[PDB]
Enzyme design. Structure first.
Site, PDB file in Angstrom:
ATOM      1  N   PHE A   1       0.815  -1.186   0.000  1.00  0.00           N
ATOM      2  CA  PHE A   1       0.000   0.000   0.000  1.00  0.00           C
ATOM      3  C   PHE A   1       0.866   1.262   0.000  1.00  0.00           C
ATOM      4  CE2 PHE A   1      -3.098   2.621   2.617  1.00  0.00           C
ATOM      5  CZ  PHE A   1      -4.014   2.784   1.573  1.00  0.00           C
TER       6      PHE A   1
ATOM      7  N   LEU B   1       0.696  -5.966   1.491  1.00  0.00           N
ATOM      8  CA  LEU B   1      -0.351  -6.333   0.539  1.00  0.00           C
ATOM      9  C   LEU B   1       0.253  -7.214  -0.564  1.00  0.00           C
ATOM     10  CD1 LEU B   1      -2.915  -5.246   1.549  1.00  0.00           C
ATOM     11  CD2 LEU B   1      -2.795  -3.420  -0.143  1.00  0.00           C
TER      12      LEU B   1
ATOM     13  N   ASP C   1       6.082  -9.411   6.304  1.00  0.00           N
ATOM     14  CA  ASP C   1       5.026  -8.848   7.139  1.00  0.00           C
ATOM     15  C   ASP C   1       3.705  -8.688   6.405  1.00  0.00           C
ATOM     16  OD1 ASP C   1       4.644  -8.329   9.954  1.00  0.00           O
ATOM     17  OD2 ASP C   1       4.289  -6.232   9.470  1.00  0.00           O
TER      18      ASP C   1
ATOM     19  N   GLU D   1      -7.895 -19.431   2.957  1.00  0.00           N
ATOM     20  CA  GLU D   1      -6.672 -19.423   2.156  1.00  0.00           C
ATOM     21  C   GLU D   1      -6.803 -18.901   0.729  1.00  0.00           C
ATOM     22  OE1 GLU D   1      -6.375 -23.639   3.518  1.00  0.00           O
ATOM     23  OE2 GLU D   1      -7.630 -22.195   4.615  1.00  0.00           O
TER      24      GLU D   1
ATOM     25  N   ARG E   1      -5.895 -15.227   0.849  1.00  0.00           N
ATOM     26  CA  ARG E   1      -4.602 -14.810   1.423  1.00  0.00           C
ATOM     27  C   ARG E   1      -3.486 -15.831   1.172  1.00  0.00           C
ATOM     28  NH1 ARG E   1      -5.623 -18.589   6.237  1.00  0.00           N
ATOM     29  NH2 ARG E   1      -3.346 -18.829   5.969  1.00  0.00           N
TER      30      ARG E   1
ATOM     31  N   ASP F   1      -0.843 -18.607   2.124  1.00  0.00           N
ATOM     32  CA  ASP F   1      -0.916 -19.821   2.954  1.00  0.00           C
ATOM     33  C   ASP F   1       0.091 -20.715   2.292  1.00  0.00           C
ATOM     34  OD1 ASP F   1      -3.327 -20.205   0.853  1.00  0.00           O
ATOM     35  OD2 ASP F   1      -2.447 -22.124   1.364  1.00  0.00           O
TER      36      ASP F   1
ATOM     37  N   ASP G   1       0.160 -21.996  -1.727  1.00  0.00           N
ATOM     38  CA  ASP G   1       0.362 -21.156  -2.910  1.00  0.00           C
ATOM     39  C   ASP G   1       1.688 -21.373  -3.631  1.00  0.00           C
ATOM     40  OD1 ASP G   1      -2.169 -19.860  -2.384  1.00  0.00           O
ATOM     41  OD2 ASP G   1      -1.207 -18.340  -1.224  1.00  0.00           O
TER      42      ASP G   1
ATOM     43  N   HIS H   1       6.997  -2.579  10.754  1.00  0.00           N
ATOM     44  CA  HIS H   1       6.501  -3.119   9.490  1.00  0.00           C
ATOM     45  C   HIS H   1       7.588  -3.135   8.392  1.00  0.00           C
ATOM     46  CE1 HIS H   1       3.557  -4.223   6.530  1.00  0.00           C
ATOM     47  NE2 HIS H   1       3.703  -3.102   5.847  1.00  0.00           N
TER      48      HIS H   1
END
Ligand SMILES: CCCCCCCCO[C@@H]1O[C@H](CO)[C@@H](O)[C@H](O)[C@H]1O
Ligand SMILES: CCCCCCCCO[C@@H]1O[C@H](CO)[C@@H](O)[C@H](O)[C@H]1O
Ligand SMILES: CCCCCCCCO[C@@H]1O[C@H](CO)[C@@H](O)[C@H](O)[C@H]1O
Ligand SMILES: CCCCCCCCO[C@@H]1O[C@H](CO)[C@@H](O)[C@H](O)[C@H]1O
Ligand SMILES: CCCCCCCCO[C@H]1O[C@H](CO)[C@@H](O)[C@H](O)[C@H]1O
Ligand SMILES: *[P@@](=O)(CCCCCCCCCCC)OC
Ligand SMILES: [Ca+2]
Lengths: 449, 85
Positions: A78, A154, A177, A188, A191, A193, A196, A264
């Site tokens: 982001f 992201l 992070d 999953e 996001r 996991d 992937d 972060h």
């Protein structure tokens, strides 16, 4: 609702993409044209200038892309852009140790908007990257196992979206992070996991709850190996006062970013250093981080400890299980590399009250004095402690003991170390002996025994 | 400024503010922050009156050996290396 695009396919606001506790809003990602994902290539041949390529033979062909070496994509999060210095800063360190096609994925066309919309824009970017990977496979017979996608915040989930679409055939993904909001606790599909990629390793540096703590990253375990340096909640050197964070050694811009999200951003700062410090980030398997700092997870197990970062793929049991937790401490400023030792001092001389310090001397050098214990120093008692050294000393040849206290006794006591045992992270032990005792603030030199 | 018990890397005006008693800076025209005292065998500075150092004094039980001059004192350049005794 469903919106479809050429090349990328359809995208729908069906559950779980929307309509769940973690993602209520029914948002669809922007158009491919708007997100405007761009691939900026850097190579050993072109380390300072990016060649903007795309999924088309003329591009790959005209460019420096070599099909005989690994390819690493770096996706930002982001508000950022692929031209941010930190991204190219990673390739440049990679050029110091390997030949590689370094690709920075820019999508500022979709990242500099409302967060809920940036979170959805993530799926176009993932789509764009899986398209590019499948292209390299079909067009050049290039295997997605040569592919490594690194994603921050992201971008960690965009990397996971790109892996879903290639059915976990990509070599590895590294989530730096992974963002928490709109992803933690969800399915999953939505996001990152372990499924992937052939291997997924994650560095957790800002896992405090988004509310009220405002921790941008997740605490939930999302890969094969999940690392929590410094505990994964608060990073050393982050809590400096406002004027110092902003006016830090790297210029205002770096300082400002750090004022905004130091913890972060530590995740990519750590990863960048590991690249050129292959043994500097030994992570230790352990129940939790408190048990670690309680000196209960040392030394490395048989077969070793995984190196957090770049070299995590060299770990033998990387995919033996999913969500394996590792702990380790780093530095508070560049050259975040630390080597953990353990020393056991057996006291001699008089019972006194004070702090005991030790410094290590080896073939590769010596270190700072590290406090091993403070309180009542009673004779023949042994105290141990593990600590993170800023230098690797190699084979130990000498250890210097030293004590002191704020209150000097009118008797002039003498405290000694009859024996000190240094144990390195791989389990090597060296023993030192001394029959002497010393006044406070005098180094007692112990020799090999 | 006016804030005690500072950490390494935090800006300072004087060593009194730093936990590690060494407010340090590499050059004359550059900001100084708290730094750790010199470990054995590395470069140091003789304790000073100026409050800041270009190199930090040594840790406990250590002596910063080097040429100590009258000019070196007013110039904050009484450099040496940390030695055991
Ligand atoms: C996102 C909207 C504002 C972007 C920030 C504009 C000011 C900071 O901009 C930054 O300036 C630095 C010096 O050139 C560079 O390192 C960065 O690449 C540049 O973006
Ligand atoms: C002798 C080697 C000294 C290296 C010290 C670190 C130099 C700058 O590099 C790093 O840049 C980042 C920028 O935000 C900071 O967070 C790091 O902690 C900082 O140290
Ligand atoms: C001319 C350049 C020197 C000016 C003073 C440099 C002070 C650098 O100082 C270093 O900064 C880091 C974070 O800022 C900390 O982690 C280090 O421990 C600190 O000593
Ligand atoms: C508005 C701020 C004015 C007063 C600030 C005085 C201290 C500022 O900082 C000082 O800057 C000098 C050059 O950069 C360095 O030599 C000093 O060591 C440094 O601490
Ligand atoms: C990344 C875009 C959103 C930024 C939100 C910044 C909100 C404040 O948060 C920030 O400031 C706090 C104090 O400086 C720090 O302690 C936090 O670590 C940091 O998140
Ligand atoms: P990652 O892409 C984002 C991680 C989560 C940030 C959410 C906060 C944004 C909402 C505003 C509150 C500060 O960051 C690079
Ligand atoms: Ca997934």
């Amino acid at each position: 609702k469903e919106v479809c695009y050429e090349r990328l396919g359809c995208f729908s606001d069906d559950s779980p993409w929307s309509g769940i506790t973690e993602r209520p809003l029914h948002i669809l990602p922007w158009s491919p044209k708007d997100v405007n994902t761009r691939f900026l290539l850097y190579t050993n041949e072109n380390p300072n200038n990016f060649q903007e390529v795309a999924a088309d033979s003329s591009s790959i062909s005209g460019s420096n892309f070599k099909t005989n070496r690994k390819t690493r994509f770096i996706i930002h999060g982001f508000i950022d852009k692929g031209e941010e210095n930190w991204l190219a800063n990673v390739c440049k360190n990679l050029f110091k140790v390997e030949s590689v096609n370094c690709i920075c994925v820019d999508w500022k066309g979709g990242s500099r908007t409302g967060y809920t919309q940036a979170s959805q824009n993530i799926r176009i970017v993932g789509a764009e990257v899986a398209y590019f990977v499948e292209f390299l496979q079909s067009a050049f017979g290039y295997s997605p196992s040569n592919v490594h996608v690194i994603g921050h915040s992201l971008g960690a989930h965009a990397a996971g979206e790109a892996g879903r679409r290639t059915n976990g055939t990509i070599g590895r993904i590294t989530g730096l992070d992974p963002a928490e909001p709109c992803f933690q606790g969800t399915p999953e599909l939505v996001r990152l996991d372990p499924s992937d990629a052939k291997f997924v390793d994650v560095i957790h540096t800002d896992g405090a709850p988004i509310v009220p703590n405002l921790g941008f990253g997740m605490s939930q375990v999302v890969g094969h190996l999940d690392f929590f340096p410094n505990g994964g909640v608060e990073m050393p050197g982050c809590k400096k006062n406002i004027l110092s964070q902003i006016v830090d050694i790297d210029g205002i811009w770096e300082g400002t970013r750090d004022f905004a999200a130091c913890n972060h951003l530590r995740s990519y700062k750590y990863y960048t250093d590991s690249i050129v410090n292959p043994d500097g980030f030994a992570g230790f398997p352990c129940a939790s981080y408190n048990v670690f700092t309680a000196n209960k997870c040392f030394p490395c197990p048989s077969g070793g400890c995984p190196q957090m970062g770049h070299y995590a793929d060299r770990y033998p049991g990387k995919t033996n299980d999913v969500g394996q937790k590792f702990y380790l401490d780093t530095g508070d400023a560049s050259n975040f590399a630390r080597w953990r030792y353990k020393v056991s001092v057996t006291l001699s001389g008089k019972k006194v009250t004070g702090h005991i310090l030790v410094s290590l001397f080896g073939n590769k050098g010596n270190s700072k004095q590290y406090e091993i214990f403070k309180g009542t120093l009673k004779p023949d008692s042994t105290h141990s402690n593990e600590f993170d050294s800023d230098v690797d000393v190699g084979d130990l040849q000498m250890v210097k003991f030293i004590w002191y206290n704020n209150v000097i006794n009118p008797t002039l006591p003498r405290v000694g170390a009859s024996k000190i045992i240094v144990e390195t992270n791989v389990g090597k032990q060296f023993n030192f002996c001394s029959p002497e005792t010393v006044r406070e603030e005098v180094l007692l030199t112990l020799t090999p025994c | 400024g006016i804030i005690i018990n500072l950490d390494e890397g935090e800006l300072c005006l004087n060593s009194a503010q730093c936990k590690s008693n060494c407010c340090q800076h590499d050059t004359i025209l550059s900001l100084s922050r708290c730094a750790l005292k010199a470990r054995e065998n590395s470069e140091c500075s003789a304790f000073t009156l100026y409050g800041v150092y270009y190199k930090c004094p040594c840790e406990r039980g250590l002596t910063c050996e080097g040429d100590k001059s009258l000019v070196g004192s007013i110039t904050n350049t009484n450099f040496g290396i940390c030695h055991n005794v």
